[PDB]
């Protein structure tokens, strides 16, 4: 008796955010599916965030390297906001090297096939000395939500708080949709906002799969 919603198009506005329009829906389901999908998306999406850093010339995050404009703490806080996606294995170690005067952008990291960088213009630290080199090993892990470094627990390691969730903000609106002779149908438009590491269609399908798997317990009651 009810109708079946399905994806209609994926309108891309920028490399970070896009919108999804749904097949026309019955009354009462515009705000029922929309809010559930928004909650799932903002709650539990997979993420590929940085966890630990290993800079050669430091012992702790409260020190200062020579020739680097920013403190080690600022370097960590800039690395925490690095957007990266992996394909093969859940964890990977990235290598960074730079020398001479100039900013140390994320494009200077190695270019392994599975690991992809979506923001090559991201700036980690500045080099102000004529002959100063920075060499760090960045560890990237896959997870969900926000796992603080003070709970998941040598001396050369520096732990960085992990913010896995790729979606930044999700909005939706319900507007009248014209199809067949029914004037009681509407389409749900979801405008989402990623850091650039997840495809909107994949995120929507994952959220719907999670919701259906959760409801499978109720349907068995």
């Amino acid at each position: 008796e009810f109708l079946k919603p399905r994806l209609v198009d994926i309108e891309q506005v920028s490399s970070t955010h896009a919108k999804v329009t749904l097949e026309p829906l019955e009354r009462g389901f515009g705000h029922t599916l929309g809010n559930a999908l928004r909650r799932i998306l903002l709650s539990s999406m997979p993420g590929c965030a940085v966890t630990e850093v290993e800079i050669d010339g430091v012992l702790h995050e409260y020190s200062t390297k020579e020739g680097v404009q920013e403190d080690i703490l600022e370097i960590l806080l800039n690395l925490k906001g690095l957007a990266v996606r992996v394909q093969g294995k859940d964890e990977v170690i990235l290598t960074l090297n730079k020398s001479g005067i100039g900013p140390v952008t994320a494009a200077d990291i190695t270019h392994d096939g599975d690991v992809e960088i979506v923001k090559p213009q991201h700036v980690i630290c500045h080099l102000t000395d004529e002959n100063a080199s920075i060499s760090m090993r960045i560890k990237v892990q896959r997870g969900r939500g926000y796992v603080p470094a003070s709970t998941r627990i040598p001396i050369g390691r520096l732990l960085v708080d992990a913010c896995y969730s790729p979606v930044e903000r999700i909005a939706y609106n319900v507007e009248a949709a014209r199809v067949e002779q029914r004037t009681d149908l509407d389409k749900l438009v979801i405008e989402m906002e990623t850091n650039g590491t997840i495809d909107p269609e994949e995120a929507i399908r994952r959220a719907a799969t999670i919701l259906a798997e959760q409801l499978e317990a109720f349907v068995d009651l």
């Binding site: 705000h31 929309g34 809010n35 928004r38």
Partner: protein, 50 residues
Amino acid sequence: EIKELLKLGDLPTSGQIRLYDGRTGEQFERPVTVGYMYMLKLNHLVDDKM
């Protein structure tokens, strides 16, 4: 002056916008005051008092 500054942007002059409930998705029955305010963290931490 505050109203003139608000009108320069794309914000309502009254300063009250219409929010939504996060958990239920239902609109609040009245507009509420939303804006940016400067918060300080005082030097009375709970972990030093428990």
